[PDB]
Write a protein that binds this ligand. Structure first.
Ligand code: IT4
Ligand code: IT4
Length: 129
């Protein structure tokens, strides 16, 4: 894409040790699957394209970008060592939205619907085995 958007977050790095855990499997097969198909998922399914959206200040404000397209790749390509890393990526995505946008805004209400679902699912994150 555009040189004016940053490169996306890292999804592949052989130097980073990787592991499958039952918790990570749940994050893919339950959590991500649920949020991805939500009616309000589409703004969060790829990095924010600040050029196309005419938001030239977006990456001036948001210095830790994250999105569900990145998280999906990270889960499908086994990037993580543990569930906390992946939960932190979800939380970063929500908090970016809430920091950049006004509390009324449609994108915020969309993020909040996904976050409510997320919380319900994370409360049932299985014990690590
Ligand atoms: O099971 C599937 O086919 C599937 C498809 C998309 C996503 Br996101 C999660 C899934 O688990
Ligand atoms: O600025 C944002 O947070 C944002 C993200 C994705 C889309 Br699509 C529109 C937006 O306004």
């Amino acid at each position: 894409g555009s040189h004016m958007n940053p490169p996306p977050p890292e999804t592949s790095n052989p130097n980073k040790p990787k592991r499958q855990t039952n918790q990570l499997q749940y994050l893919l097969r339950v959590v991500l699957k649920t949020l991805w198909k939500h009616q309000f998922a589409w703004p969060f399914q790829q990095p924010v394209d600040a050029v196309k959206l005419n938001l030239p200040d977006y990456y001036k404000i948001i210095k830790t970008p994250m999105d569900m397209g990145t998280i999906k790749k990270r889960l499908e390509n086994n990037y993580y060592w543990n569930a906390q890393e992946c939960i932190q990526d979800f939380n970063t995505m929500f908090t970016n939205c809430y920091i950049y946008n006004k509390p009324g805004d449609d994108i915020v209400l969309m993020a909040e619907a996904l976050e409510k679902l997320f919380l319900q699912k994370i409360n049932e994150l299985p014990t690590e085995e």
